[PDB]
Amino acid sequence: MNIMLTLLTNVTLASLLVLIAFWLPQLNAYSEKTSPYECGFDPMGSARLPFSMKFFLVAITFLLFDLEIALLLPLPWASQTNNLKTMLTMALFLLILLAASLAYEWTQKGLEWAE
Amino acid sequence: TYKFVNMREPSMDMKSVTDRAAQTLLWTELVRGLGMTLSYLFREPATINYPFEKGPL
Amino acid sequence: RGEYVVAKLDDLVNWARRSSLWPMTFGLACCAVEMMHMAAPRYDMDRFGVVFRASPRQSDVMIVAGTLTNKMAPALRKVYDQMPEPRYVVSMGSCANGGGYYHYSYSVVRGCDRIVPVDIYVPGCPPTAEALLYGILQLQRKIKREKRLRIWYRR
Amino acid sequence: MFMINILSLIIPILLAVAFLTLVERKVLGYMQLRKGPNVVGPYGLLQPIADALKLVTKEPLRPGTSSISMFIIAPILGLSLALTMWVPLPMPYPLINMNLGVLFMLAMSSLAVYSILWSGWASNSKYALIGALRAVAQTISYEVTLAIILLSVLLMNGSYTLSTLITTQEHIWMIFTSWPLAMMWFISTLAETNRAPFDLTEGESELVSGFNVEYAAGPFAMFFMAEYANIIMMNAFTAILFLGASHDPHTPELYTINFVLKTLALTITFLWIRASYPRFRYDQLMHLLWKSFLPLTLALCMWHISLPIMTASIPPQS
Amino acid sequence: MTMYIAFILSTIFVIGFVGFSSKPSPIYGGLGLIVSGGVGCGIVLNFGGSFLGLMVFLIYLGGMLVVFGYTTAMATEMYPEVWVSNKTVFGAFVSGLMMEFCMVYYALKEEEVEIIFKFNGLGDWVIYDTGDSGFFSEEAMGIAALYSYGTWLVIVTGWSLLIGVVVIMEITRGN
Amino acid sequence: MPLVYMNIIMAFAIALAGLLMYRSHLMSSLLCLEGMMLSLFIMSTLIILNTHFTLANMMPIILLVFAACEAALGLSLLVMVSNTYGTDYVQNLNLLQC
Amino acid sequence: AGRIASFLKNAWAKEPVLVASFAIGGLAIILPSLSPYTNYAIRINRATPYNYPVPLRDDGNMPDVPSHPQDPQGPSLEWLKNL
Amino acid sequence: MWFEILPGIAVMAACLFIPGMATAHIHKFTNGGKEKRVAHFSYQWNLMERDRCISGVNRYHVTKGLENID
Numbered sequence A: 001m002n003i004m005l006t007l008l009t010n011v012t013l014a015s016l017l018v019l020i021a022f023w024l025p026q027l028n029a030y031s032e033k034t035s036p037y038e039c040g041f042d043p044m045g046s047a048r049l050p051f052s053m054k055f056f057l058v059a060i061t062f063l064l065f066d067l068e069i070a071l072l073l074p075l076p077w078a079s080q081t082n083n084l085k086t087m088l089t090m091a092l093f094l095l096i097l098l099a100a101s102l103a104y105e106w107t108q109k110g111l112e113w114a115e
Numbered sequence B: 001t002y003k004f005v006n007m008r009e010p011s012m013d014m015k016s017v018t019d020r021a022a023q024t025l026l027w028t029e030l031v032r033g034l035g036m037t038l039s040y041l042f043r044e045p046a047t048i049n050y051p052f053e054k055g056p057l
Numbered sequence C: 001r002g003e004y005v006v007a008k009l010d011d012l013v014n015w016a017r018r019s020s021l022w023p024m025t026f027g028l029a030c031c032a033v034e035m036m037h038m039a040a041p042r043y044d045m046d047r048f049g050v051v052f053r054a055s056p057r058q059s060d061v062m063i064v065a066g067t068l069t070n071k072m073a074p075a076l077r078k079v080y081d082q083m084p085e086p087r088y089v090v091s092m093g094s095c096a097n098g099g100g101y102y103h104y105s106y107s108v109v110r111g112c113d114r115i116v117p118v119d120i121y122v123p124g125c126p127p128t129a130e131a132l133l134y135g136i137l138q139l140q141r142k143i144k145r146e147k148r149l150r151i152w153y154r155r
Numbered sequence D: 001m002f003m004i005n006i007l008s009l010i011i012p013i014l015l016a017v018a019f020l021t022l023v024e025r026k027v028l029g030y031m032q033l034r035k036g037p038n039v040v041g042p043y044g045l046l047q048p049i050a051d052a053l054k055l056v057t058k059e060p061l062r063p064g065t066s067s068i069s070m071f072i073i074a075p076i077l078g079l080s081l082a083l084t085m086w087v088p089l090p091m092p093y094p095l096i097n098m099n100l101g102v103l104f105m106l107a108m109s110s111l112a113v114y115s116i117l118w119s120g121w122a123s124n125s126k127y128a129l130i131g132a133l134r135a136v137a138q139t140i141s142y143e144v145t146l147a148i149i150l151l152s153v154l155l156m157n158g159s160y161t162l163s164t165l166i167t168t169q170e171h172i173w174m175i176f177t178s179w180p181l182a183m184m185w186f187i188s189t190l191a192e193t194n195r196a197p198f199d200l201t202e203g204e205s206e207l208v209s210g211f212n213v214e215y216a217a218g219p220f221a222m223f224f225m226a227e228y229a230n231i232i233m234m235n236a237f238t239a240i241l242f243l244g245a246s247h248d249p250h251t252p253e254l255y256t257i258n259f260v261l262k263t264l265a266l267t268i269t270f271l272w273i274r275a276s277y278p279r280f281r282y283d284q285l286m287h288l289l290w291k292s293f294l295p296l297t298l299a300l301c302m303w304h305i306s307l308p309i310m311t312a313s314i315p316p317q318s
Numbered sequence E: 001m002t003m004y005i006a007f008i009l010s011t012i013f014v015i016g017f018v019g020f021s022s023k024p025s026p027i028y029g030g031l032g033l034i035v036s037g038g039v040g041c042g043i044v045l046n047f048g049g050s051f052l053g054l055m056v057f058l059i060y061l062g063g064m065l066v067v068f069g070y071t072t073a074m075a076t077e078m079y080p081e082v083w084v085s086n087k088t089v090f091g092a093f094v095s096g097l098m099m100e101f102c103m104v105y106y107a108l109k110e111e112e113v114e115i116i117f118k119f120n121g122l123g124d125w126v127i128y129d130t131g132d133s134g135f136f137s138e139e140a141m142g143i144a145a146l147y148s149y150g151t152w153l154v155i156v157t158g159w160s161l162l163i164g165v166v167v168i169m170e171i172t173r174g175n
Numbered sequence F: 001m002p003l004v005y006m007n008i009i010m011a012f013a014i015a016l017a018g019l020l021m022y023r024s025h026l027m028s029s030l031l032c033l034e035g036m037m038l039s040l041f042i043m044s045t046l047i048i049l050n051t052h053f054t055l056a057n058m059m060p061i062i063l064l065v066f067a068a069c070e071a072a073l074g075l076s077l078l079v080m081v082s083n084t085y086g087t088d089y090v091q092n093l094n095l096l097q098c
Numbered sequence G: 001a002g003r004i005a006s007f008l009k010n011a012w013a014k015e016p017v018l019v020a021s022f023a024i025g026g027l028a029i030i031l032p033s034l035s036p037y038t039n040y041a042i043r044i045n046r047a048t049p050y051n052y053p054v055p056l057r058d059d060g061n062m063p064d065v066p067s068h069p070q071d072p073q074g075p076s077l078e079w080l081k082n083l
Numbered sequence H: 001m002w003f004e005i006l007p008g009i010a011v012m013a014a015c016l017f018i019p020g021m022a023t024a025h026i027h028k029f030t031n032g033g034k035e036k037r038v039a040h041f042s043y044q045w046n047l048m049e050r051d052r053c054i055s056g057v058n059r060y061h062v063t064k065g066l067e068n069i070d
């Protein structure tokens, strides 16, 4: 209940602001006011052709690293155990491989952004 | 008469490297930049109240 | 009364318009340098609500500062046509007004008027940063005397 | 008495960002020797209202190459995400006492970036797609440090409940035990909200736009109010997490006064750094986090898993 | 009306599931997955899985972000498709909506559905169990035991993900 | 076996059907691949939570750990096929017909 | 010594962050074995009564198990108060 | 001067003060003065439910001391 009412109120408030955004200010528009903005002169035709960036390698390792943080998230409740020696060894073990993966990723070009 | 603007070689003694490392980790030149923006905040703005205060000609 | 209600409502909109003008800098020539001095803390254009904002989709007024060369004339029209249009154009300097020093050249249009409609004209070469502040102040007065709602109520 | 509570949060929040835009220029101007807005009302106390009213009466227009549906929903995503995120903040007593409040704010804050590129992609503009692609890898790389920094600090909490920070830093401020993590936490907050050591998301100098590329009066207002609200919170979250305050159970007003003051001081610092540093280039801001922040991030993490064990200071789970 | 949000939430999960399974443009597929992913987090939260619910929320959001971050990178179409666009995607879409809406109609009108397995409509609130949980949430302590009872799983998961970074570079390196 | 089980089981079927009907996109194909993962994760979460299989609550987590691991593999493979052949429609890689 | 000291000083100059991180990372592993409070952390976690201490039937010949919670025999954790 | 900045803070500080005061007072108002009982675990919720049943008026915050039994 409480959480969904808050979620509902926010989207209605946001949507109402859109509705008064596009309707209260009346429009006198044409085909040149809808032209894409390219700092003045005519665009050469772009914005949907393959725009290949370079950080794809580190973009996808973020996904791998984001899974590491998922694995080590339960640590606050993991400390409340009776065998901390095993918990400590395993907790540092995940951090070590996370550090090891970053270090090996670093050494082989890795974080460097392709030219 | 010419002067070399950028020909400063930092010292390699244990003192200087730590200060550079301390500058690196504990951001100091960034704090010096921050600290001086605070100095201008408390200063006297130079804006003239146009059109009640027209500029000097 | 209906006329009174539309009168106050128009004033509220006109106050909201004149109190927030966001120039889209078309800095072209030495007229632009003096305009930046208006943004400099000596005159502080920002203090009047008017603050510089790029992306003509998010700007209200054009400040034509400098000569308008025939080569770039399509650019002036295109960036003028892309403004959400409660919109006004301020011409700075003799060159932007009617050609100025280069009125007789082969590649300078004799005034920015031939490309775009022009609101208040700011004379000078360059007009001092204080003179432009007077110009922007004149536009605020012009916006104040807008009867958009009264005309609609009497259509 | 819940609709009143919610509307006692939404209206003050939108009014807080409302006049944050006034304390921006009036602070930015004074730091650059200007004076800021002091014409519209006394001391500019009416300038944002004049700004807002104009930004809901000047002609909005969808781009001719836009994608209407995604163009419109992105402001909905930005504003609703910003408002819904303030919900579990434990101002004396939080509005919604989530058991996992920390994880909640991490999840939705990771969602506020879908607005920026859905806006960028639907706008079908070259500067739009550039700014959209700049921002996404900017935020997620800065998100890896965001998650670990939160975890390392909260290992002394014993739980993810936001209310327990009041109890955790009851006698001692948390920053005195995790100040190295506090520095990178502040920098990451500067980066997720796109303030201006890393405002490249807007990139006005090199990309003219990117927060709101062709976005107009309404949608531009949202994408602004959706990120200035994040400015106030990301310092409220920093204030609640690091700089605790005395909380008498009988008089919560003292805590609210103290909590507001810390957010105000932190927010000024966000404006303070904004006018004291240049713009990070893209590779630099990525290099700073993937090559300098993360190695220190993991190292201080391992420290904070071990630290309670070596000192026998495991916090209570409840 | 608040009878049981499990079916309503799972329905939006399926309708969102129908969306990207109909092969739209990849960016619109991300939206179709995200709504299903977000409401799927809602389903698990309603069942007591508070941590796991927000868990799939955070990971997937980052997961699918790099997904459609990639599509606009090198998988974009010079004229992107949409939910209507081509009749194939239109046909694939509307097929999914009419399908699921048929099963739920088949579900809610006799409550004795026997497709593949048995499915009887009586209310997912019923399968809940009566009993306290002490001063600990059961789910949180279960996933916390990964570092105490699951040291074998940590090793294989950690090693695989470390190898996961090795393959990703090795595959993407080339030449 | 209430109707929520029907919803996600029938959901996984359309994920299976969606994957097995590649129309014109590898990226959209990978979407359906990760789609399957939702229903499996969601159903698994419902099972071990309903049965109070507390020690098995880790299984949905380990599913996700090996989930994105495949997801990374799919896009990395999608990187080169789109890089050296231009697009990602799964029809231009038929050079291995002979 | 000469080889190691030159290496550490050089790394302390060019890449202060890495030599830093490797330090705390190094200490994060080796002190927890050395420090003597680790056994206390186990004892504190063990001593926490999440579940009920279910009574065990008294058939006699259980001298160590108390019959009343206030009885002296049994696990006493007065050390927690002192610690 | 810089003190002219303060009105910008004051109208924001008061606005940010409202949610802290409103939530704190609404909880006290809607729960008969005492703070809203927090149930982070099922055991806390079990006490709250038994409070609702015992009070008779189906109000958890309405509490009965020794005088209920005799």
Ligand SMILES: COC1=C(OC)C(=O)C(C/C=C(\C)CC/C=C(\C)CC/C=C(/C)CC/C=C(/C)CC/C=C(\C)CC/C=C(\C)CC/C=C(\C)CC/C=C(\C)CC/C=C(\C)CCC=C(C)C)=C(C)C1=O
Residues within 6 Å of the ligand: A008, A009, A012, A013, C051, D007, D011, D014, D015, D017, D018, D019, D021, D022, D024, D025, D048, D049, D050, D051, D052, D055, D194, D195, D196, D199, D202, D203, D204, D220, D221, D222, D224, D225
């Ligand atoms: C590079 O770097 C950059 C940045 O930074 C890093 C930047 O910053 C910036 C930004 C630039 C600047 C700061 C420079 C100067 C520019 C400006 C100041 C621009 C100003 C912009 C604005 C948007 C103005 C903001 C100012 C104000 C005053 C905003 C004020 C707000 C409002 C008027 C609205 C407030 C909210 C209201 C009224 C909400 C009302 C709500 C209700 C009545 C209730 C609604 C809800 C309900 C009724 C719920 C119940 C309903 C139900 C249940 C319905 C159910 C329905 C069913 C169908 C079921 C740029 C450009 C940048 O380049």
Ligand code: SF4
Residues within 6 Å of the ligand: C029, C030, C031, C065, C066, C067, C092, C093, C094, C095, C096, C100, C101, C124, C125, C126, C127
């Ligand atoms: S009017 Fe004078 S100052 Fe202005 S652009 Fe022309 S020559 Fe330069």
